Scaffold this active site. Structure first.
Site, short mmCIF file in Angstrom:
data_model
loop_
_atom_site.label_atom_id
_atom_site.label_comp_id
_atom_site.label_asym_id
_atom_site.label_seq_id
_atom_site.Cartn_x
_atom_site.Cartn_y
_atom_site.Cartn_z
N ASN A 75 10.89 -5.12 8.77
CA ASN A 75 11.21 -3.73 9.22
C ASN A 75 12.63 -3.28 8.84
O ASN A 75 13.40 -2.99 9.77
CB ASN A 75 10.95 -3.47 10.70
CG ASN A 75 10.51 -2.04 10.94
OD1 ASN A 75 10.26 -1.30 10.00
ND2 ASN A 75 10.41 -1.66 12.21
N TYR A 83 11.39 1.57 -1.77
CA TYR A 83 10.15 0.76 -1.62
C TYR A 83 9.74 0.18 -2.97
O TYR A 83 9.48 -1.03 -3.02
CB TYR A 83 9.09 1.60 -0.92
CG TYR A 83 9.32 1.81 0.55
CD1 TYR A 83 10.52 1.46 1.14
CD2 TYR A 83 8.34 2.35 1.36
CE1 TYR A 83 10.75 1.64 2.50
CE2 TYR A 83 8.55 2.54 2.72
CZ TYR A 83 9.75 2.18 3.29
OH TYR A 83 9.96 2.37 4.62
N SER A 98 13.14 -0.44 6.99
CA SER A 98 13.27 1.02 7.25
C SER A 98 14.01 1.18 8.57
O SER A 98 14.61 2.24 8.79
CB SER A 98 11.89 1.62 7.19
OG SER A 98 11.12 1.25 8.32
N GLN A 148 0.86 -1.22 0.00
CA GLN A 148 0.00 0.00 0.00
C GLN A 148 0.88 1.25 0.00
O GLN A 148 1.81 1.30 0.83
CB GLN A 148 -0.92 -0.01 1.23
CG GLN A 148 -1.80 1.22 1.35
CD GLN A 148 -2.46 1.30 2.70
OE1 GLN A 148 -2.01 0.69 3.67
NE2 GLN A 148 -3.55 2.05 2.78
N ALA A 186 6.37 -2.35 2.40
CA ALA A 186 7.30 -2.56 1.27
C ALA A 186 8.74 -2.70 1.77
O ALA A 186 9.56 -3.19 1.00
CB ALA A 186 7.17 -1.45 0.28
N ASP A 187 9.05 -2.27 3.00
CA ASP A 187 10.41 -2.48 3.53
C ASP A 187 10.46 -3.87 4.16
O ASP A 187 11.51 -4.22 4.73
CB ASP A 187 10.77 -1.43 4.58
CG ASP A 187 10.04 -1.57 5.91
OD1 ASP A 187 9.20 -2.48 6.01
OD2 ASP A 187 10.33 -0.77 6.83
N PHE A 232 0.32 5.44 0.09
CA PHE A 232 -0.56 6.63 0.05
C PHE A 232 0.35 7.85 0.13
O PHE A 232 1.08 7.97 1.12
CB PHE A 232 -1.57 6.54 1.18
CG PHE A 232 -2.71 5.58 0.97
CD1 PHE A 232 -2.69 4.68 -0.08
CD2 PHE A 232 -3.80 5.57 1.81
CE1 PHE A 232 -3.74 3.79 -0.28
CE2 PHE A 232 -4.85 4.69 1.62
CZ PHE A 232 -4.82 3.80 0.57
N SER A 289 12.56 5.92 8.50
CA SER A 289 11.08 5.78 8.35
C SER A 289 10.58 6.67 7.21
O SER A 289 10.79 7.90 7.29
CB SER A 289 10.38 6.12 9.64
OG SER A 289 9.06 6.57 9.39
N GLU A 303 2.55 -6.26 15.12
CA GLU A 303 2.62 -5.05 14.25
C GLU A 303 1.67 -5.21 13.05
O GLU A 303 1.36 -6.37 12.70
CB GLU A 303 4.05 -4.83 13.77
CG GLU A 303 5.09 -5.04 14.85
CD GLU A 303 5.00 -4.10 16.04
OE1 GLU A 303 4.28 -3.08 15.94
OE2 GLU A 303 5.66 -4.38 17.06
O1 LIG Z 1 3.75 8.03 2.79
C1 LIG Z 1 3.67 6.85 3.15
C2 LIG Z 1 4.44 6.23 4.19
C3 LIG Z 1 4.26 4.93 4.47
N1 LIG Z 1 3.35 4.15 3.79
C4 LIG Z 1 3.17 2.73 4.10
O2 LIG Z 1 3.63 2.49 5.43
C5 LIG Z 1 4.58 1.40 5.42
C6 LIG Z 1 5.54 1.55 6.57
O3 LIG Z 1 6.65 2.37 6.16
P1 LIG Z 1 7.98 2.45 7.01
O4 LIG Z 1 8.45 1.06 7.21
O5 LIG Z 1 8.98 3.43 6.39
O6 LIG Z 1 7.53 3.09 8.40
P2 LIG Z 1 7.75 2.47 9.85
O7 LIG Z 1 8.23 1.08 9.79
O8 LIG Z 1 8.71 3.45 10.51
O9 LIG Z 1 6.36 2.60 10.49
C7 LIG Z 1 5.20 1.47 4.03
O10 LIG Z 1 5.76 0.22 3.65
C8 LIG Z 1 3.98 1.81 3.17
O11 LIG Z 1 3.23 0.63 2.91
C9 LIG Z 1 2.57 4.68 2.78
O12 LIG Z 1 1.76 4.02 2.15
N2 LIG Z 1 2.78 6.01 2.52
MN LIG Z 2 9.42 -0.04 8.64
#
Ligand SMILES: O=c1ccn([C@@H]2O[C@H](COP(=O)(O)OP(=O)(O)O)[C@@H](O)[C@H]2O)c(=O)[nH]1
Ligand SMILES: [Mn+2]
Length: 304
Positions: free
Chosen positions: A293, A47, A295, A23, A195-196, A25, A300, A226
């Site tokens: 995880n 991503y 990122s 996903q 996606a990470d 957004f 992030s 999570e």
């Molecule tokens: O602008 C954004 C930021 C995040 N994501 C979604 O949120 C997930 C989590 O992102 P990330 O791992 O960077 O954040 P964290 O692990 O710090 O919550 C991503 O894989 C996307 O699927 C998204 O759709 N849009």
């Molecule tokens: Mn992450």
């Protein structure tokens, strides 16, 4: 066939044909070109690359991208190009799916909570909350009275929608007329992956406790569930429905924690007395070919 935590739970298996979901957004859809993919692929957060490496391995399986944002027409031609480049990849847009069956007017939620608090004596009521509830009710004078619309900013904008997509699950690909969908039925589910989350090698048939499993990012001793990985065996899996009920009844309810994390605890009756770490072990989406995880050792994607 059967596992257990507090009772006997029917482990469920997933046809490798079980689809995977990603996903994205984007609030500022302009930070990227008006002819290339509006997905982030930074050297710190690649991503779109990860979402493409995953597709290359599980080509047999369907891989989908639920996306939203005020994108440009050229950006739309760009996703279509990915759809041509890889038949595995199908991109779905919030505008092309009906979540109307998943919604509840913001008015009712408040008035129902107000009635309940009003019933009890004033000593037992929560004056602060009733104040918050009465204030918010008046301030929905704007024509929009829908929990869905309320969840449009960006943390909520996607979190609630991530849960709503998983509630539709495999039904999502079918509702969007995703060509190449010739391996799945209507009660099909889908596996959600941040996606990470890097797929090192095909996962193949999986087994999910009670037909469901979610990533569990444990910390120092403590362990937390999570919403980064959401594995369901059927569309509208009841644990998600419990979280949707929390959105329907609770005020200022977090989609991430009340929508999935708290919803799972009802479906298995965690009970609090029982150890949470083991329960997280029981629920834990385990996998060896998934880097969870990333990122984290990089950055992030969200400012917020
Ligand atoms: O602008 C954004 C930021 C995040 N994501 C979604 O949120 C997930 C989590 O992102 P990330 O791992 O960077 O954040 P964290 O692990 O710090 O919550 C991503 O894989 C996307 O699927 C998204 O759709 N849009
Ligand atoms: Mn992450």
């Amino acid at each position: 066939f059967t596992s257990f935590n507090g009772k006997d739970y029917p482990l469920c298996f997933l046809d490798e044909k079980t689809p995977l979901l990603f996903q994205w957004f984007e609030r500022n859809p302009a930070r990227f070109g008006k002819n290339d993919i509006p997905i982030i692929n930074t050297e710190k957060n690649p991503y779109l690359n990860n979402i493409i490496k995953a597709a290359t391995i599980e080509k047999e399986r369907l891989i989908g991208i639920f996306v939203d944002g005020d994108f440009f027409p050229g950006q739309k031609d760009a996703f279509s190009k990915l759809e041509y480049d890889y038949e595995n990849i199908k991109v779905i847009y919030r505008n092309d799916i009906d979540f109307s069956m998943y919604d509840k007017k913001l008015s009712e939620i408040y008035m129902e909570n107000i009635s309940k608090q009003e019933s009890m004596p004033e000593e037992k009521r929560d004056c602060h909350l009733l104040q918050l509830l009465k204030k918010e009710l008046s301030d929905i004078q704007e024509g929009n009275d829908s929990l869905i619309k309320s969840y449009l900013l960006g943390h909520g904008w996607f979190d609630f929608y991530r849960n709503m997509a998983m509630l539709k699950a495999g039904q999502l690909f079918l509702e969007a007329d995703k060509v190449g969908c010739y391996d799945l039925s209507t009660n099909s589910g889908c596996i959600y992956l941040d996606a990470d989350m890097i797929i090192t090698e095909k996962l193949g048939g999986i087994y999910i406790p009670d037909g469901i499993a979610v990533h569990v990012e444990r910390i120092d001793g403590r362990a937390s569930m999570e919403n980064g990985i959401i594995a369901v065996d059927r569309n509208n899996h009841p644990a998600l429905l419990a979280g949707l009920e929390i959105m329907h009844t609770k005020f200022d309810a977090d989609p991430y924690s009340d929508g999935v994390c708290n919803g799972i605890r009802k479906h298995f009756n965690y009970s609090l007395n029982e150890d949470y770490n083991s329960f997280c072990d029981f629920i834990e989406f385990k996998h060896d070919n998934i880097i969870m995880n990333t990122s984290q050792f990089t950055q992030s994607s969200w400012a917020r």
